[PDB]
C-alpha cells in the first residue's frame, strides 16, 4: 500500500500548516483511481447496452473527429510518459512502481474511452451522462495534482520538469475535452433538441437558448415552437392509458355488478380505477421524480452545516487560511448541484402533469363518441365541456402536488432533527408554534376557496346582465334607460366588490402568516432556549444555523395545507371523471350495418323505446323500402315520425326486433348543426374538394344567391361568432352537405321548416325529386306539407307510434279508405403610461405609504438581524456583560420588540395594499361602465359585442384579482432583495462593486425571458380555447356525426388540436426552467462572492457577522427568480388596464342636458319641420339625407315608403338626434333639437323597434325601469294591449318574472308588450318600424286599431317596408336617393297621371 509508491501515503501534518499540500503518493493514488474507477466500473454496461440495441445510424462530423483526435493525443501523451519513465531507469537507482504503472492504466483507460466515444455514435444522444460525468470527475480530481505540481515548481524546485510539463499538457487537453463534451452535438433536424442535447446542456437547459433568442428578435409564431417527441403525443399516451386501464376498469365493473346484484337480492358506478390506472401507466416518471426529489432534499441540508463550519472557521483566530476557501467553494458546488437536481425534478413533474391532463382529455373525447344514450342524457353540453375544461386541470394539479406532499414531510422531519441537534430539546417551542399555525393555514385556504367560488358565481351573473345590456343597447339608447341599467349592474358590482375585499383580506392574512412564521419561531425558540437553563449559551453557530434551518423549513411547512386541500378537491373531481368514463357504451345489436343485403332497409318487427321506464314509443312495425325509392313518411304531430327517424339512426333503445341496414347513410335533422369555420368546410365535411360536384350542389339548392348575399363569400365565416345565419340557410347548407356526402341512403327530417313555397319546391325538384340529383339514391323523407305528396312513390302513414299501411299516391286516390281519411285530415290548414394610469387609479398617497411602510418593515428586519448578531457576540466576551439576568432579559425583550415591529409594519403595508387595490378596481370599473354607455351608436356598430363583453369580463376580473396580487408580490420580492443586498454590503463594502456586473447579468436574463414568455402565454391562450369549443361542437351534434360515420376523422382532429396545445405548454414549462437555472445561478453567485469576501476579510470581522451575512445570502437564491417571474406576470396582465383605459377614452355623443331645459311639454302637441338636412350614418363617409325640407302637421298619420335604400331607416335615427345633423336642424313648434339637451328628449319620445328584444328579470322594470308610472296606469296600459289575460294566467301582478326564449313572453306577447309601452309613453310624436312579415296578422290588426283609436291625435311616422298597409295613411311621403320629390295625400299621389309611384300592387 506504500511500497508501490516509495513515498508517504497519508500525512495529516502537511495539512496542519498554513501552506498545506496533499502527499504526492495519495494524490496519484486516490485522485487517480477515482475517475478511472468510475469509468471502468460502468463502461462494459454502457457498451453492451449501446451495441445490443442500435440502428444503422452512423456519421462522422467535426465533433466526433475532434474528440477522437484529442483522445488519441491523450494516448500519445501517456505513451511518451511511459517512455520517459522507462528511460529514466538509468537516471536514478530505482524508480517508484507508480511512475511506470500509472501509464499502463492510462493507456488502457484511454483505449476504453476511444471505444466508448465511438460506440456513442449509434445512440441518439452523442454526449450522454457517462462521458460528461467522467470528464467532470477527472478535472475535479486532477486540479489537486495540477496545483501541487505548479506550487512545487513555483519555489525554484528544478526537478523532473518534463513530467510536470507533460501533466500540464494532459490536463489542458482534458479541460478542452470536457469543454467539447459540454456542447450539444450537431442536430439531425428530425427530433426536438430536448432529446438530442448533451448531458450538460440537458441538465442546464441551454438547448432552449435558440428559442429564447428567436423570441427576442421577432415575435414567436406557432410554427416557431418546437414539436414534442412521440412519447408525449396524445395518441401514444392515450393508447398506453387504455392498455393499462382496461384491466382495472373490467375489475371495477365486475365488482360493481356483484355489488348491484347483492343489493338487489343509479348513483353506483364502477369506481376506484382512474388513480390506479394513471399510476400504473406513469410509474416510471413517478419513480424518477421521486428519486430526484429525495436526492435534492437530502442535499438541501448541507448548506447549514457548511455555514456552521464557516462561522467556526472565522471565529478561531489560529485557523488555517487554506480552509474557508474550501468551505466557500463547497457551498457554491452544493448549491449548483442542488439547483440542477431541483429544476430537473420540476421539469419531470410538470411534464407528467401535462401528460395526465392530455390523456384525461383525450379519453373524455374518445368516450363522448361512444357514450350510450342514457348516459348522454344524464349530462349536458355545458356541464360536459366544463368537465373536460376543469376536472382535467384539477387532476393535473393533483399530479403536481402528490410528488410534493411527501417531500414536504421528509424535509420537515429532517429539519426538525437538525434543529434538535443544534438547540437541544428546546426546539419543541418552535414545533408547537409552527404546528398550531398549520390548521390556521388549512382553514384560511378552505375559506379562500369558498369565497372564490362565490365570486365566480357573482361574476357569472354580472356577465349575463352585461351581455343582455350590450345585445339590446339599440332600444336602450332609444328609450333613455342608461341610468337604470347602469345602476343595477353598479349594485351587482358593489356586492361583488364586498366579496372581493373579503377574499383579499383572507389572502393577505395567509401571506402575513407565511411571512411571520419564521420570525415568530425564531423569537420563541431562542427565548425558550436561553431561559430554560443558565448552562446553555447562544453562540453564533447555534443561532444562525438554526435560522437557516427555520428558513429551509418555512416553505414545506406552509405548503402542506394547500396541497392537502387541493388533493381533497381532486378526489371529487376524479370521482366525477371515473363516473363518466365508466358508463356503458351504446348498443349496436339492433341496428346492423350489413355489408350486402336486399333493399338496404328491413324492419324485422322492431320495437324501439325512448326510455325503458315508459311505454314503448314504437312497436310491432314492419316496413321494407326498395333501393332508389323515395319514401315520405307522414303523420300527426307527436305520432313518432321523428321517433321513427331516430330509431332508424339507432339513437334509441329497443326491446326486441332488429333492423337490417346496408350501405353508407346520410342524415339531416330539423335542427341543423353548424360547425365553427367556413361554409365551404361545412359542405365538404372532410371529403375531398370537387369543383364539379360542388357547383352541382350549389345549383341544386338555393345557395348561390345566398352566397352572393353573404358578405364574406364562399369562405366567409360561420359558427361561434359567425354572421348569425338564418334557420332556412342552415337547413339549406345541411341539405347541401347531405347531398355532397353522396351516401346510398338519405334520412331527411323536416329540412324545409323555415323555407318558402317556391324555393322549397325547387330544392325538392332539383335534389329529392324524380329528376333530382339523388335519383339513384333512396331517401326517407319526413314532411308536413301537401305540395310534395303527389310526387311520393311510397308513402307510409304513421299513427300513435305504429304504421298503418303502405302505398303510393295512386293507392291514396284508389283505396278511398284509410289513406283517403288520412289525407283529408292532413291538408286541413408595456409602456410606462399604462402603469401610470393604473397607479393613478390606485392613488399616489396610498402607494407612497405602502412603499414607506414596507421599507420600515425591512429596516426593522435588518435591525433584528443586527441585534441577533450582537446577542450572539456577547457570549464570546463573558467579561461581565453576561451572567446577569438584566442583560439576558434585555436581549430577549429587544429581540421580541424588533420582531413585533417587523410584523405590524408588514401587516399595515399589506392591509393598505388590499384597500388601495380594491378602490382602484372600483374606480376603473365605474369609469369604464359610465363611458361605454352614452357612447355614440357608431362605436357599437363598428366594435363587435363579443369584444366589449370580453373586455368587461376578463379584463375587469384580471384588474380585480390578479393585478393586486402580482404587484404586491413584486414589491415583496424587490424589498427582500434590497434588504439582503444592503445587509451583505453592510459587512463587506467591497461587495457593492460586484453589484454592478451581477445586476447587468440579471437584467439581461430578465429581458430575454420576458420577450419570450409573453408570446408563449399568448400562444397558449390562442390554442387552449379551440379544443373545448370543438368538444362542444362534437357533443351537440353527435347524432349527425354518428350517422355520417365520420368518427375517426373527428377523433384525429381532436388529437391534433391537443398536440398543438401541448407543444406550446411544454415550451412554456421549459422556458420557466431555463430562467430558473439562470437566476438560481445568479443568486448562488451572490452567496459565493459574499462567502469569499468574508473569508478574505477574516481578520477584521467576527464570526457573528459571517453568520448573519451568510444566513440571509442563502435565502436570495429563489427571490431573484420569483422577482423576474412576477415582473413578467405584471407585464402580461397589465394589458387589462390598457384595454380598459382605451375603451374609457372613446368618443361621447352630445351631453345629457346642455344647461337649457325644455318647457313642461317639449313636443307642444304640435307640428314638426324638416329644414335643409345633410346627415350621414357615420361622419364623412356618404351623405344619406340631403336636400330635404318638409312640414308635418299636428295629428297627421304621415307615412313614408321611399325605396329599398337606407334613407327609409334614417329618419328615425335623425328624430332622436342619434345622428348629428351637419346641415340645418329640426324645428318642432319653434323648439330646435340642436339647442336643447339629449336624454330628456329621448325620454319623452316613443318608438316601436323593428326587432324588439327582451331584458331579463321582471315585467315591471322591463316595461318601466324608472318606476315613474303608477301600477294602475300600467295595468290600464296592458288593458288596451289586452295582455292582462296572459299575466293573470301567469304569476298575477306587475312584477312577474320574465326571461329570454320561447318558454315565456312569446313573440305575440313581446309585440303586445312593446305596443303597450309605446302607448303609455304618451308623446305626441309616434315613430314605427316594421321589417318582418312573419308577424301574425291579428297582432297587426289590433295594434293598428289601437293606434288609430288612441294615437290618432298624435303624429305618427310608420316606417314600413310592406306596401299593403300604407294606403290608409292620411299622408304619404316618398324619399328617393336621399331626396324628396313629392308631398301630399295618397289620393294626390295617385292623382299624378295615374300610379306614377308604387305601381306594383302585388
Ligand atoms: C406561480 C404561482 C404559484 C404564484 C407563486 C407565488 C410566489 C411567486 C410569491 C407568493 C409569496 C411570495 C414569497 C413570500 C415571502 C418571501 C420572503 C422573502 O424573504 C424575506 O423577506 C424575509 C422574511 C421577512 O421579510 O420577514 C423572500 C421572497 C418570498 C419567498 C416571496 C417570494 C415570491 C412568493 C413566493
Ligand atoms: C402548481 C405546482 C405547485 N408546486 C409543486 C411543484 C412540484 S410549487 O413547488 O409550489 C412550484 C414551483 C415552481 C413553479 C414554477 O417554476 O413556475 C411553480 C410551482
Ligand atoms: C411557489 C414557490 C416555489 N418556490 C418557493 C420559493 C419560496 S421554489 O423555490 O421554486 C421551491 C423550493 C423548494 C421546494 C421543495 O423543497 O419542495 C419547492 C419549491
UniProtKB/Swiss-Prot annotation:
Known catalytic reactions:
an S-substituted glutathione(in) + ATP + H2O = an S-substituted glutathione(out) + ADP + phosphate + H(+); taurolithocholate 3-sulfate(in) + ATP + H2O = taurolithocholate 3-sulfate(out) + ADP + phosphate + H(+); ATP + H2O + xenobioticSide 1 = ADP + phosphate + xenobioticSide 2; 17beta-estradiol 17-O-(beta-D-glucuronate)(in) + ATP + H2O = 17beta-estradiol 17-O-(beta-D-glucuronate)(out) + ADP + phosphate + H(+)
Q: Which InterPro entries match?
A: AAA+_ATPase, ABC1_TM_dom, ABC1_TM_sf, ABC_transporter-like_ATP-bd, ABC_transporter-like_CS, ABC_transporter_C-like, MRP, P-loop_NTPase
Q: EC number(s) per UniProt?
A: 7.6.2.-, 7.6.2.2, 7.6.2.3
Which of the seven top EC classes does this enzyme belong to? translocase
Membrane-spanning segments:
27-47, 68-88, 93-113, 126-146, 165-185, 278-298, 325-345, 402-422, 426-446, 509-529, 552-572, 840-860, 902-922, 966-986, 988-1008, 1080-1100, 1103-1123
Tell me the residue numbers annotated for binding ATP 2.
1202-1209
Residue ranges annotated for the ABC transporter domain, each copy included: 601-825, 1168-1402
Q: Which residues form the ABC transmembrane type-1 domain?
A: 286-569, 847-1132
Q: In the record, which positions carry Phosphoserine? A: 1306
The UniProt entry, under Pfam families, shows:
ABC_membrane (PF00664), ABC_tran (PF00005), TMD0_ABC (PF24357)
Which tissues does the record link to its expression? Mainly expressed in the liver.
- Cite the entry's keywords alphabetically: ATP-binding, Cell membrane, Glycoprotein, Lipid transport, Membrane, Nucleotide-binding, Phosphoprotein, Repeat, Translocase, Transmembrane, Transmembrane helix, Transport
Record keyword Translocase present: yes
Q: Name one GO biological process term.
A: response to estradiol
Segments in the Extracellular topological domain: 1-26, 89-92, 147-164, 299-324, 423-425, 530-551, 861-901, 987, 1101-1102
Among the GO molecular function terms of this UniProt record, one is: organic anion transmembrane transporter activity
Disorder association: Defects in Abcc2 are a cause of hereditary conjugated hyperbilirubinemia (EHBR).
Question: What NCBIfam families does its record include?
Answer: MRP_assoc_pro (TIGR00957)
Q: Which PANTHER family match?
A: ATP-BINDING CASSETTE SUB-FAMILY C, ATP-BINDING CASSETTE SUB-FAMILY C MEMBER 2
> Which protein are we looking at?
ATP-binding cassette sub-family C member 2
- Per the UniProt entry, what species is this protein from, by scientific name? Rattus norvegicus
Amino acid at each position: 500500500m506504500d511500497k508501490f509508491c516509495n513515498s508517504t501515503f497519508w500525512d495529516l501534518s502537511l495539512l496542519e500548516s498554513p501552506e498545506a499540500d496533499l502527499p504526492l503518493c495519495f494524490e496519484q493514488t486516490v485522485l487517480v483511481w477515482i475517475p478511472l474507477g468510475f469509468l471502468w466500473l460502468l463502461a462494459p454496461w454502457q457498451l453492451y447496452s449501446v451495441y445490443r440495441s442500435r440502428t444503422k445510424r452512423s456519421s462522422i462530423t467535426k465533433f466526433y473527429l475532434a474528440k477522437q483526435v484529442f483522445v488519441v493525443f491523450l494516448l500519445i501523451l501517456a505513451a511518451i510518459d511511459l517512455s520517459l519513465a522507462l528511460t529514466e531507469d538509468t537516471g536514478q537507482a530505482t524508480v517508484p512502481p507508480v511512475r511506470y504503472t500509472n501509464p499502463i492504466l492510462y493507456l488502457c483507460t484511454w483505449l476504453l474511452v476511444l471505444a466508448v466515444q465511438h460506440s456513442r455514435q449509434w445512440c441518439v444522444r452523442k454526449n450522454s451522462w457517462f462521458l460528461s460525468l467522467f470528464w467532470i470527475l477527472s478535472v475535479l480530481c486532477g486540479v489537486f495534482q495540477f496545483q501541487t505540481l505548479i506550487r512545487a515548481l513555483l519555489k525554484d524546485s528544478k526537478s523532473n520538469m518534463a513530467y510536470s510539463y507533460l501533466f500540464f499538457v494532459s490536463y489542458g487537453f482534458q479541460i478542452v475535452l470536457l469543454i467539447l463534451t459540454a456542447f450539444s452535438g450537431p442536430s439531425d433536424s428530425t427530433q426536438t433538441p430536448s432529446v438530442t442535447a448533451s448531458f450538460l446542456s440537458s441538465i442546464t437547459f441551454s438547448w432552449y437558448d435558440r428559442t429564447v433568442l428567436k423570441g427576442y428578435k421577432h415575435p414567436l409564431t406557432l410554427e416557431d415552437v418546437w414539436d414534442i417527441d412521440e412519447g408525449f403525443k396524445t395518441r401514444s399516451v392515450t393508447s398506453k392509458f387504455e392498455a393499462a386501464m382496461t384491466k382495472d376498469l373490467q375489475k371495477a365493473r365486475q365488482a360493481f355488478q356483484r355489488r348491484l346484484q347483492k343489493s338487489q337480492r343509479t348513483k353506483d358506478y364502477p369506481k376506484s380505477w382512474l388513480i390506479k390506472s394513471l399510476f400504473k401507466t406513469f410509474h416510471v416518471v413517478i419513480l424518477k421524480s421521486f428519486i430526484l426529489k429525495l436526492i435534492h432534499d437530502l442535499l438541501v441540508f448541507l448548506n447549514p452545516q457548511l455555514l456552521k463550519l464557516l462561522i467556526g472557521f472565522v471565529k478561531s483566530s489560529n485557523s488555517y487560511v487554506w480552509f474557508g476557501y474550501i468551505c466557500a467553494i463547497l457551498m457554491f458546488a452544493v448549491t449548483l448541484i442542488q439547483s440542477f437536481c431541483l429544476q430537473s425534478y420540476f421539469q419531470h413533474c410538470f411534464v407528467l402533469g401535462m401528460c395526465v391532463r392530455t390523456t384525461v382529455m383525450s379519453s373524455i373525447y374518445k368516450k363522448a363518441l361512444t357514450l350510450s344514450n342514457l348516459a348522454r342524457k344524464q349530462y349536458t353540453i355545458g356541464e360536459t365541456v366544463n368537465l373536460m375544461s376543469v376536472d382535467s386541470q384539477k387532476l393535473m394539479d393533483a399530479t403536481n402536488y402528490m410528488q410534493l406532499v411527501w417531500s414536504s414531510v421528509i424535509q420537515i422531519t429532517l429539519s426538525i432533527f437538525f434543529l434538535w441537534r443544534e438547540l437541544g430539546p428546546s426546539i419543541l417551542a418552535g414545533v408547537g408554534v409552527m404546528v398550531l399555525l398549520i390548521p390556521v393555514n388549512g382553514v384560511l385556504a378552505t375559506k379562500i376557496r369558498n369565497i372564490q367560488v362565490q365570486n365566480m358565481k357573482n361574476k357569472d351573473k354580472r356577465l349575463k346582465i352585461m351581455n343582455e345590456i350590450l345585445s339590446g343597447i339599440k332600444i336602450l339608447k332609444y328609450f333613455a334607460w342608461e341610468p337604470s341599467f347602469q345602476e343595477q349592474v353598479q349594485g351587482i358590482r358593489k356586492k361583488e366588490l364586498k366579496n372581493l375585499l373579503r377574499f383579499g383580506q383572507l389572502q393577505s392574512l395567509l401571506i402575513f402568516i407565511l411571512q411571520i412564521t419564521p420570525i415568530l419561531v425564531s423569537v420563541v425558540t431562542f427565548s425558550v432556549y436561553v431561559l430554560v437553563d443558565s448552562a446553555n449559551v447562544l453562540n453564533a453557530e447555534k443561532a444562525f444555523t438554526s435560522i437557516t434551518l427555520f428558513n429551509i423549513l418555512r416553505f414545506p411547512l406552509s405548503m402542506l395545507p394547500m396541497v392537502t386541500s387541493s388533493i381533497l378537491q381532486a378526489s371529487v373531481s376524479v370521482d366525477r371523471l371515473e363516473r363518466y368514463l365508466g358508463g356503458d357504451d351504446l348498443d349496436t345489436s339492433a341496428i346492423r350495418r350489413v355489408s350486402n343485403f336486399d333493399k338496404a332497409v328491413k324492419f324485422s318487427e322492431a320495437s324501439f323505446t325512448w326510455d325503458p321506464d315508459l311505454e314503448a314509443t314504437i312497436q310491432d312495425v314492419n316496413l321494407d323500402i326498395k333501393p332508389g325509392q323515395l319514401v315520405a313518411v307522414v303523420g300527426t304531430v307527436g305520432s313518432g315520425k321523428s321517433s321513427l327517424v331516430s330509431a332508424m339512426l339507432g339513437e334509441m333503445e329497443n326491446v326486441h326486433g332488429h333492423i337490417t341496414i346496408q350501405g353508407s347513410t346520410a342524415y339531416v335533422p330539423q335542427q341543423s348543426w353548424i360547425q365553427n369555420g367556413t361554409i365551404k368546410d361545412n359542405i365538404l365535411f372532410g371529403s375531398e374538394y370537387n369543383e364539379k360536384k360542388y357547383q352541382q350542389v350549389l345549383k341544386a339548392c338555393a345557395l348561390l344567391p345566398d352566397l352572393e348575399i353573404l358578405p364574406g363569400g364562399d369562405m366567409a365565416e360561420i359558427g361561434e361568432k359567425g354572421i348569425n345565419l338564418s334557420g332556412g340557410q342552415k337547413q339549406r347548407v345541411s341539405l347541401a352537405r347531405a347531398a355532397y356526402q353522396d351516401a346510398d341512403i338519405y334520412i331527411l327530417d323536416d329540412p324545409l321548416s323555415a323555407v318558402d313555397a317556391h324555393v322549397g319546391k325547387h330544392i325538392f325538384n332539383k335534389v329529392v325529386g324524380p329528376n333530382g340529383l339523388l335519383a339513384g339514391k333512396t331517401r326517407i323523407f319526413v314532411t308536413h306539407g301537401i305540395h310534395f305528396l303527389p310526387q311520393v312513390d311510397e308513402i307510409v302513414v304513421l299513427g300513435k307510434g305504429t304504421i298503418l299501411e303502405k302505398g303510393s299516391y295512386r293507392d291514396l286516390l284508389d283505396k278511398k279508405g284509410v289513406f283517403a281519411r288520412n289525407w283529408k285530415t292532413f291538408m286541413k290548414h408595456v409602456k410606462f403610461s399604462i402603469y401610470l394610469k393604473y397607479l393613478q387609479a390606485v392613488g399616489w398617497w396610498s402607494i407612497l405609504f405602502i412603499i414607506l411602510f414596507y421599507g420600515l418593515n425591512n429596516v426593522a428586519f435588518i435591525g433584528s438581524n443586527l441585534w441577533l448578531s450582537a446577542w450572539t457576540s456577547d457570549s464570546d466576551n463573558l467579561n461581565g456583560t453576561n451572567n446577569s439576568s438584566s442583560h439576558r432579559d434585555m436581549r430577549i425583550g429587544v429581540f421580541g420588540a424588533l420582531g413585533l415591529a417587523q410584523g405590524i409594519c408588514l401587516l399595515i403595508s399589506t392591509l393598505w395594499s388590499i384597500y388601495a387595490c380594491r378602490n382602484a378596481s372600483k374606480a376603473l370599473h365605474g369609469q369604464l361602465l359610465t363611458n361605454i354607455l352614452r357612447a355614440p351608436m357608431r362605436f357599437f356598430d363598428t366594435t363587435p359585442t363579443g369584444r366589449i363583453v370580453n373586455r368587461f369580463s376578463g379584463d375587469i376580473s384580471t384588474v380585480d384579482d390578479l393585478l393586486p396580487q402580482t404587484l404586491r408580490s413584486w414589491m415583496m420580492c424587490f424589498f427582500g432583495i434590497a434588504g439582503t443586498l444592503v445587509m451583505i454590503c453592510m459587512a463587506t463594502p467591497v461587495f457593492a462593486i460586484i453589484i454592478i456586473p451581477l445586476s447587468i447579468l440579471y437584467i439581461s436574463v430578465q429581458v430575454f425571458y420576458v420577450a419570450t414568455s409573453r408570446q408563449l402565454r399568448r400562444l397558449d391562450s390562442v390554442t387552449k380555447s379551440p379544443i373545448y369549443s370543438h368538444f362542444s361542437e362534437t357533443v351537440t351534434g353527435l347524432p349527425i356525426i354518428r350517422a355520417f360515420e365520420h368518427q375517426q376523422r373527428f377523433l384525429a382532429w381532436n388529437e391534433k388540436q391537443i398536440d398543438i396545445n401541448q407543444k406550446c405548454v411544454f415550451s412554456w414549462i421549459t422556458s420557466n426552467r431555463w430562467l430558473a437555472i439562470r437566476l438560481e445561478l445568479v443568486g448562488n453567485l451572490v452567496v459565493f462572492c459574499s462567502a469569499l469576501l468574508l473569508v478574505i476579510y477574516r481578520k477584521t470581522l467576527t464570526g457573528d457577522v459571517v453568520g448573519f451575512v451568510l444566513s440571509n445570502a442563502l435565502n436570495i437564491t429563489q427571490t431573484l427568480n420569483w422577482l423576474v417571474r412576477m415582473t413578467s406576470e405584471a407585464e402580461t396582465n397589465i394589458v387589462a388596464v390598457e384595454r380598459i383605459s382605451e375603451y374609457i377614452n372613446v368618443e361621447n355623443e352630445a351631453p345629457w342636458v346642455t344647461d337649457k331645459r325644455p318647457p313642461a311639454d317639449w313636443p307642444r302637441h304640435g307640428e314638426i319641420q324638416f329644414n335643409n338636412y345633410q346627415v350621414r350614418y357615420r361622419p364623412e363617409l356618404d351623405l344619406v339625407l340631403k336636400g330635404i325640407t318638409c312640414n308635418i302637421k299636428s295629428g297627421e298619420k304621415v307615412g313614408v315608403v321611399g325605396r329599398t335604400g337606407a334613407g327609409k331607416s334614417s329618419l328615425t335615427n335623425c328624430l332622436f338626434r342619434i345622428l348629428e345633423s351637419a346641415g340645418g336642424q329640426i324645428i318642432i313648434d319653434g323648439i330646435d333639437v340642436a339647442s336643447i339637451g339629449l336624454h330628456d328628449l329621448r325620454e319623452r319620445l316613443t318608438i316601436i323597434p323593428q326587432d324588439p328584444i327582451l331584458f331579463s328579470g321582471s315585467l315591471r322594470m322591463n316595461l318601466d325601469p324608472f318606476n315613474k308610472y303608477s301600477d294602475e296606469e300600467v295595468w290600464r296600459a296592458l288593458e288596451l294591449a289586452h295582455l292582462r289575460s296572459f299575466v293573470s294566467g301567469l304569476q298575477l301582478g306587475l312584477l312577474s318574472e320574465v326571461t329570454e326564449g320561447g318558454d315565456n313572453l312569446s313573440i305575440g306577447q313581446r309585440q303586445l308588450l312593446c305596443l303597450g309601452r309605446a302607448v303609455l309613453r304618451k308623446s305626441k310624436i309616434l315613430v314605427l318600424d316594421e321589417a318582418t312579415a312573419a308577424v301574425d296578422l291579428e297582432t297587426d290588426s289590433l295594434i293598428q286599431t289601437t293606434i288609430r283609436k288612441e294615437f290618432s291625435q298624435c303624429t305618427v311616422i310608420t316606417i314600413a317596408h310592406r306596401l299593403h298597409t300604407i294606403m290608409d295613411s292620411d299622408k304619404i311621403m316618398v324619399l328617393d336617393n336621399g331626396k324628396i320629390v313629392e308631398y301630399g295625400s295618397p289620393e294626390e299621389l295617385l292623382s299624378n297621371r295615374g300610379s306614377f309611384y308604387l305601381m306594383a300592387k302585388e
